[PDB]
Design a protein around this ligand. Structure first.
Ligand SMILES: [Cu+2]
Ligand SMILES: [Cu+2]
Ligand SMILES: [Zn+2]
Ligand SMILES: [Zn+2]
Lengths: 156, 156
């Protein structure tokens, strides 16, 4: 009675799309994340899991960053971060991007489960809460939402 | 926690799309299902919860009907049915459809939770296992999958 794989197809109306795959060996163990994108402008783009798996009104209805530990916005590596903080996806000159990471806070089970929630890639770079701006400690000052998608359970 | 709201945006490459909204006021209470579709052929269309929230490969990876109680396919009102069996959506002459129902098998919490799974609307009518076809007791012989979507948690 525990999930070990999840998938997320991300679309929008900006010419940006991608797919994210998650695998979790144990109930509370780390989660391996792998995403692929196309149509992005060269550079870094904020990448986080939002609280709602609702995409009825673009990516706006997805709400804010999944934050069950009630912390401020940070980098994946920080102790003080939103469970949903996954940092930046890097796109090359061709507009394509490959993202890989192993995270210990997100999960496919329990209270920190992202199943049924949304992944969102932003237009600007996530300053990881260090930018010294108004939204730095809240969203990373990453701006608009290019694409998003609900996170669904994947086959064994 | 406990989820009281859920949503599912359904798309595909058959010109069919829709939005499903779920409401469960108490963790073990009945689930109110509301759905709207456009682009459908006049008549009935199988409407079920499939096991995987995997929509890649044009709904072909969604899996079989969500069947945790290991029973055969039936109508929503039958004592014998898959948890995921929600019957048929009825499209009017214009191709639009409105669906409303209260179900007691599906849930937004627990082992019968449909969060992170897929909603699928079919090409043809679900014979509710009364069609006399081998596929009747498995899929209702509803035909191809026109559109599907992952069930996500919604603001409550
Ligand atoms: Cu975000
Ligand atoms: Cu089905
Ligand atoms: Zn954050
Ligand atoms: Zn069924």
């Amino acid at each position: 009675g525990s999930n070990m794989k999840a998938v997320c197809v991300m679309t929008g109306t900006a010419g940006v799309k991608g797919v994210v795959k998650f695998t979790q060996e144990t109930d509370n163990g780390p989660v391996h994340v792998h995403a692929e994108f196309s149509g992005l402008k060269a550079g870094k783009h904020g990448f986080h899991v939002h609280e709602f798996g609702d995409t009825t009104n673009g990516c706006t209805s997805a709400g804010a960053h999944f934050n069950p530990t009630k912390q401020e916005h940070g980098a994946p590596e920080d102790s003080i971060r939103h469970v949903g903080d996954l940092g930046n996806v890097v796109a090359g000159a061709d507009g394509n991007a490959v993202y890989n990471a192993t995270d210990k806070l997100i999960s496919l089970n329990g209270s920190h489960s992202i199943i049924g929630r949304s992944m969102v890639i932003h237009e600007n770079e996530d300053d990881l809460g260090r930018g010294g701006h108004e939204l730095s400690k809240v969203t990373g000052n990453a701006g608009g939402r290019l694409a998003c998608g609900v996170v669904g359970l994947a086959a064994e």
